[PDB]
Amino acid sequence: MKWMFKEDHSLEHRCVESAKIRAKYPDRVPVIVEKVSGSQIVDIDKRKYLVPSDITVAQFMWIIRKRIQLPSEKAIFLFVDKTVPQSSLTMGQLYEKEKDEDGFLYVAYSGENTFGF
């Protein structure tokens, strides 16, 4: 799963970026969102989010659904470190458990992708 964000920035650049935003907004978590390479679901305009730590994974999935205007009768999935995150975790909890070494949390999403993940 190539991540454009990582391709676009050095590891050091990403570390200082997340560190600055974590020091400055301690109640929020920095998140990169990318659709699954090769999947059929519509793409999302913005990749980089500052998400309140107290909202749940389930609620973040609804924010993403709204950002891509996914009709309600289509399914969406999020994936973090190769697995489906627990929907009832808060984003702060998910961040602490699955954050990248660069200090960002990387969330991929797809629809019912015929090609899996």
Binding site: H13, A19, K20, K24, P52, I55
Partner: protein, 169 residues
């Protein structure tokens, strides 16, 4: 409206974390991990070795070298760290250097200053502002704090806020 990052780079074991804490102890916020040292200024540190200094220094809006004295194993300014400091200077990044003396050092503050000033000059880093903290540390520490803050006041207008590009939900 931008936020400034000063990175302290230099050998392990020189007390860079405690230096950053001492610098931040008298700040209103106290009421790589970055610590706020007054509005608009974050301080971080990386031990080089083993981190390659170049890619980190490239992210420093202010670059602070932390250097040992001559007694140490090797030499105080490692090649990669000297080259990273030259690259900062070339691009106009403000450069500071620190000698953090500590109990029972072979060098008085005066000797450490003269020898470290000479070393820096000979490596093309004569424009580095050199701070020599006595073992007892103080006046030099407060000069360092104020130099960091004033360099950062000037740079904020060149730099975006940290939220730049983030969708803030």
């Amino acid at each position: 409206q931008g936020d400034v990052t000063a990175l302290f780079l230099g050998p392990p074991g020189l007390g860079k974390s405690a230096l950053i804490a001492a610098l931040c102890d008298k700040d209103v916020e106290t009421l790589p991990s970055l610590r706020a040292a007054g509005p608009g200024l974050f301080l971080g540190e990386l031990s080089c070795p083993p981190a390659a200094p170049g890619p980190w220094a490239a992210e420093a809006n202010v670059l602070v070298l932390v250097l040992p004295g001559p007694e140490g194993n090797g030499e105080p300014l490692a090649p990669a760290l000297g080259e990273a400091a030259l690259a900062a200077l070339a691009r106009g990044t403000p450069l500071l250097a620190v000698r953090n003396l500590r109990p029972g050092d072979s060098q008085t503050a005066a000797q450490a200053r003269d020898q470290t000033a000479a070393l820096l000059n000979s490596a093309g880093l004569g424009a580095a502002d050199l701070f020599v903290l006595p073992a007892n540390c103080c006046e030099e520490l407060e000069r360092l704090r104020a130099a960091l803050q004033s360099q950062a006041e000037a740079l904020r207008r060149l730099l975006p806020p940290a939220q730049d590009g983030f969708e803030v939900l």
